[PDB]
Amino acid sequence: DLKLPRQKVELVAPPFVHAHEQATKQGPKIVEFKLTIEEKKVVIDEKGTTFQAMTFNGSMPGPLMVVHEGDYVETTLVNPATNTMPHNIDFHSATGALGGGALTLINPGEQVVLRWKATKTGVFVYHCAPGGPMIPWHVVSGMNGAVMVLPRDGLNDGKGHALKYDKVYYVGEQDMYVPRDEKGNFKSYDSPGEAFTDTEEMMKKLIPSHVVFNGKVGALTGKNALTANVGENVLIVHSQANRDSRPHLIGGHGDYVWETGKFGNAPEVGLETWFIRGGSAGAAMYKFMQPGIYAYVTHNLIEAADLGATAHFKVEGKWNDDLMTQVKAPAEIP
Amino acid sequence: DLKLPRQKVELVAPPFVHAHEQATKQGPKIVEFKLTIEEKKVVIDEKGTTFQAMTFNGSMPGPLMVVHEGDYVETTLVNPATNTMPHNIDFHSATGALGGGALTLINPGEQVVLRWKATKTGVFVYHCAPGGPMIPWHVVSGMNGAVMVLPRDGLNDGKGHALKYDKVYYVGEQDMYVPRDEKGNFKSYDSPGEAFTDTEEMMKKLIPSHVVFNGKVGALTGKNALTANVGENVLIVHSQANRDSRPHLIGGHGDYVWETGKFGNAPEVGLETWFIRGGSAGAAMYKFMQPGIYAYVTHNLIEAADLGATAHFKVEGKWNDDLMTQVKAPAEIP
Amino acid sequence: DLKLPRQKVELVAPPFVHAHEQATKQGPKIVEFKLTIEEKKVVIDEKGTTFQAMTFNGSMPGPLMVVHEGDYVETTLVNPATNTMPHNIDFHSATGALGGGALTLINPGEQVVLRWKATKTGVFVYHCAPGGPMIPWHVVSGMNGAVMVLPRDGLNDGKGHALKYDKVYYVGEQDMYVPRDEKGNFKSYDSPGEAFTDTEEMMKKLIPSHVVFNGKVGALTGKNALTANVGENVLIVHSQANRDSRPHLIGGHGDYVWETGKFGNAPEVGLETWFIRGGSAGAAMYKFMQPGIYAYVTHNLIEAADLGATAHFKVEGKWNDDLMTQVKAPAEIP
């Protein structure tokens, strides 16, 4: 007999986040979301390597869901008949039934509706988990995203001061396991089922072939670079459902970071690089001080430069010579 | 001339913990423990793979030792003549002599008695360390456990409030390196000595064949699942003497977590997944809110599902529909 | 028009650190440093394995630079014509232009002068980053070091009390990727360019052949052991520009640790093992209580004992039997 107001959310594809309030005068609501599973072959690199992806809402990562502490999150999970496998959903933000996984197993052609109370604040992973060896395989195939549960008074610095972001981006990092043939080329497969045996053999060796942001090498570069202006406070939510990551903003800092991702704890200040434990999401806020190109990377630089894990920010504004200056340009040695 | 009262402890096999007080009105005591080394071939998986184990007290992990700050811990380490190698013990809780290792090297047929003052609170690893390349080999063969040093006033939340657990479990995670033959089957050996060359070659490649809790795949499942009731506050001590781990309670949380494991620091609150640095123990407390099956995993899901690192909790009590409910069971899509 | 006093620093090779004040009554200064790049073939192990190194100032790690909050750091980077490749420098302590990398790219025969304002306190990595796949390759070839930015009032414990160290050491950990030939011996190369193809293939597999402190197996052992006396408070700065590490002082503790390395955050107390995220530096302070040999390791014990990552401390002073004692020496079992 839960008679609270209902609110529908129109999810948007990462790295963007659906519109939301930080601090709110709204009381608890039932917030309604819909996720539709899509299994699909996608291209993950600039060489044309293909991958058997499985996704929530067609994206890797799945979209970021944003609610406030004490809301009830009501998700309709849909598994169309065009898919081949059973799927479910496990929210790390939720309490009971394996995070919802034990209540959401659906075959192709079915849907289910789960409600959970958002009793814990922070950013949290959600992922598919349809039992046994299928659990890692569905997650590393792309079936993961995140939810953010905000305090109703918004974020704070642990010393009584509000922290308000001007914009938020969600960076979902994906470790992928694409097998190679005898001569050393990546293999292509006709279905997720056909990719399973070779993929699992590689998975158990624990070394990914690719580590990407937003589903593909270079996804968050060029036309699709992240953007900001000097003076803007940007929140970057970072998740990794299976493997550790160490985010770093090249040329910047984490001014306020929740590396374990949970807003009941004060943020740490002034970090160079932070650590996202596999199976979690974290968040870092930075106020841009300088214009120009920044790279956002995992600071295993082999992964960042060679395996795919680099995003860019393009930042507009005025250069600050007090903070940094080229005193003397490259010249011949005296 | 140390004339304090003596107290003997009867150690018990993991995941259980010998009986102890949290807050105590006892003053410092000399607490007496005995560990007897056993080298033994064991089965580590449901396929019948064997492993040359080396253990404290016949178990992997070694038993949890519990004392209070300011106690003196007096350990009799015994290396029976039925063993083949020298062994020792290094306590991360202890100060000096390589943690005791430099004072406890014993050949088969010898015993030694070490006393150390428990000046640092928290959970800490202990492990064998008999010099050079033998150090990693004895540890990854199973020669590690943990000790817990409690404040005399018990645990607190860093904000002045007591945190009392209703029960404690010790989960020791073991990375194992079992070599394979040409056709790809795991190899069996007649002695630890015979397993050494092949095992060391694999170890140096840094990828385990198995990652297990309590010594074997499935050790903490079925009849041997962990248990709780709705409303019980459970402390889970987690150690990993060689390699990082990222614990996660599927369907729950870490309500209070000391991921670096040291009680001089306030716990973090409301975590989804925490991080145990290789060479350390950590502790997490959770009050169960929902009945049913939970899985406790490292959230590298490949390790958890495919390499062995999953435990279960079976929890009794009343389902809470406010926290989670299946609004609509699986049905055909409209 | 920046008219502050100038101060030159004479850098010294790691693990030592150039002389500096902790708390200072000096105001902001322009502190002047010079780094000269050297590409050179070096021996990294006791078997005589060679490696194509690239370094700042001829050392791995590069020297520790020490300044105070609000200083301006003016670095002359020199790339002599005896080198073969372009190089640059990226300071994680700096704000803008990819940490300075976008302003410091120099060919063999050129130098550049960069100034940045030290607005963030802590220890921070610096490394070369000359674009694309070259970034990881130059870093894992040895082109990284660290800078320490002290509060002007020196270090504190977060509870109002000064923490003053008696001496500081800088331990730079390097993951190295040396390829093997068919029969399994490590390969030697005539130039960094010639080592590139084989080295990159190995790098992308993410498993190092060697993990060393101060450039070589055994660098910080024997005549070159670290030293202290009972009663001395020693700060150990640890960096790792590419890969995670888990420092541990065998027989000691981290009395005060900033594992994310940033002095705006209070240190954690009483750690056994701490965690240095790849792409960062951290710092730990310990007051020695016992004489004798200590080992300082990463507590992946395979890396420590088998791949090269062990340093020693030799500590003078009086043994404390209250803290630890051998109650009974090794004797035959009754």
Ligand SMILES: OC[C@H]1O[C@@](CO)(O[C@H]2O[C@H](CO)[C@@H](O)[C@H](O)[C@H]2O)[C@@H](O)[C@@H]1O
């Ligand atoms: O040329 C035959 C020879 O090649 C190997 C690979 O070294 O196997 C290749 O050819 C087989 C027969 O065509 C294929 O089945 C196999 O997939 C392919 O690798 C050898 O095993 C074989 O003797």
Ligand SMILES: OC[C@H]1O[C@@](CO)(O[C@H]2O[C@H](CO)[C@@H](O)[C@H](O)[C@H]2O)[C@@H](O)[C@@H]1O
């Ligand atoms: O059949 C001989 C042929 O097999 C190889 C493996 O490819 O070696 C196998 O046989 C050897 C002789 O019986 C064994 O010593 C060895 O352990 C086994 O792998 C080849 O090396 C050999 O030419």
Ligand SMILES: OC[C@H]1O[C@@](CO)(O[C@H]2O[C@H](CO)[C@@H](O)[C@H](O)[C@H]2O)[C@@H](O)[C@@H]1O
């Ligand atoms: O002995 C020839 C035989 O050896 C292999 C390695 O198994 O190749 C070796 O010899 C080649 C010719 O000398 C070299 O080019 C190569 O580098 C070396 O590995 C086989 O490929 C070849 O059939």
Ligand SMILES: [Cu+2]
């Ligand atoms: Cu799925």
Ligand SMILES: [Cu+2]
């Ligand atoms: Cu999960």
Ligand SMILES: [Cu+2]
């Ligand atoms: Cu041993």
Ligand SMILES: [Cu+2]
């Ligand atoms: Cu140890």
Ligand SMILES: [Cu+2]
């Ligand atoms: Cu360089």
Ligand SMILES: [Cu+2]
């Ligand atoms: Cu960097």
